[PDB]
């Protein structure tokens, strides 16, 4: 009960939205025989809607004055109250993959720039080495940290093209 938001389990507007969705989904059920493939698809859609409405509730989710679930973004407020699962862990979940992509791209860039006429490697990819780096990028933050520490991550400006202002 933070930011004036009621929990999804104890929200009247959430249940109103749920029963409105159930009503509009059951409206289309009356135009098909129960032993039909469109009827089976509509029943599967209704089951998925009910499962989504059940799982969104009692999962540390809040909604306020609209029946639509809200997300808590400030860490700490997502820690003492059970709201870390909204954005706290998935932030690191995205960042792990983003650093993975950046690290394997950097590894391919260095390992291609040390090859004769290296401009063709960007249009003519090599698959074994790119896949080898693709399955070696799980420990991307450790490699990035050690490369920053030893100085091979960055390059001396002396060797960087600089605008002549």
């Amino acid at each position: 009960d933070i930011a004036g938001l009621t929990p999804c389990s104890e929200s009247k507007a959430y249940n109103k939205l749920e029963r409105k969705e159930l009503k509009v989904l059951d409206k289309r059920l009356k135009k098909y025989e129960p032993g039909s493939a469109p009827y089976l698809a509509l029943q599967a859609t209704k089951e998925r809607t009910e499962n989504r409405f059940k799982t969104y509730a009692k999962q540390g989710l809040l909604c306020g004055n609209d029946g639509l679930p809200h997300l808590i973004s400030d860490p700490g407020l997502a820690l003492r109250f059970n709201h870390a699962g909204e954005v706290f862990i998935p932030t690191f979940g995205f960042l792990y993959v983003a650093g993975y992509i950046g690290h394997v791209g950097r590894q391919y860039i260095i390992l291609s720039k040390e090859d004769a006429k290296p401009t063709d490697k960007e249009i003519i990819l090599d698959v074994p080495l790119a896949l080898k780096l693709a399955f070696q990028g799980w420990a991307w933050p450790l490699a990035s940290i050690q490369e920053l520490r030893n100085g091979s991550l960055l390059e001396k400006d002396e060797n960087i093209t600089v605008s002549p202002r």
Partner: protein, 226 residues
Amino acid sequence: SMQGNWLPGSQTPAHLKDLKMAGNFGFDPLNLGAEPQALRWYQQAELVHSRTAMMGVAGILIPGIFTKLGALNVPQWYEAGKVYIEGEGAIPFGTLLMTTLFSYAFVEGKRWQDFRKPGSQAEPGTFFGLESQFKGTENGYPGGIFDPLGYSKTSPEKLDELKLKEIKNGRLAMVAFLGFAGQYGATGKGPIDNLADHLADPWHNTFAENGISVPGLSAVEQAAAN
């Protein structure tokens, strides 16, 4: 030197071919240990993780074994925290956490300054005169009062045999504690009870039959049964 192989026929890394280490099996496909000081820091991290894994897994197992034998009523580890929190003569959780963090920060700063500057904790007149024995023999092997029974100041053969044994039981304990966490997460019971279920009924009690470990397998089994 090079003892065994984690994968026979695999191309061992160049920084592991002629490297004198405890439990070196060539297992570094990501080449995180190519840099030497990197390897030193990772060796120290593996040593501390493994040693606290010995302590943790022993706390899992020996009270659990004695509970299975009926000697003591000590509960399983996943509810033991709530058991002590709800106890009568209990230090509060905040006080315990802060005391643990303070003491571990002190000792880990000691170990850290040992790591960055070797033998730097032996500065004279710094820790009540007892710091003269705080010199580190090797990375992660301090010695001194950390070996009060004198089991390390012998010939190097039993010394690095013991180092290999320590790293082997430590890796085993680390995977064992990962297992304890996972098999509480899936089965919801203690590891001794899980071992009893697997010994008494191996086929019907496994990681595959439990739907948390591999989702969608239960649906496959139900569809195949019908």
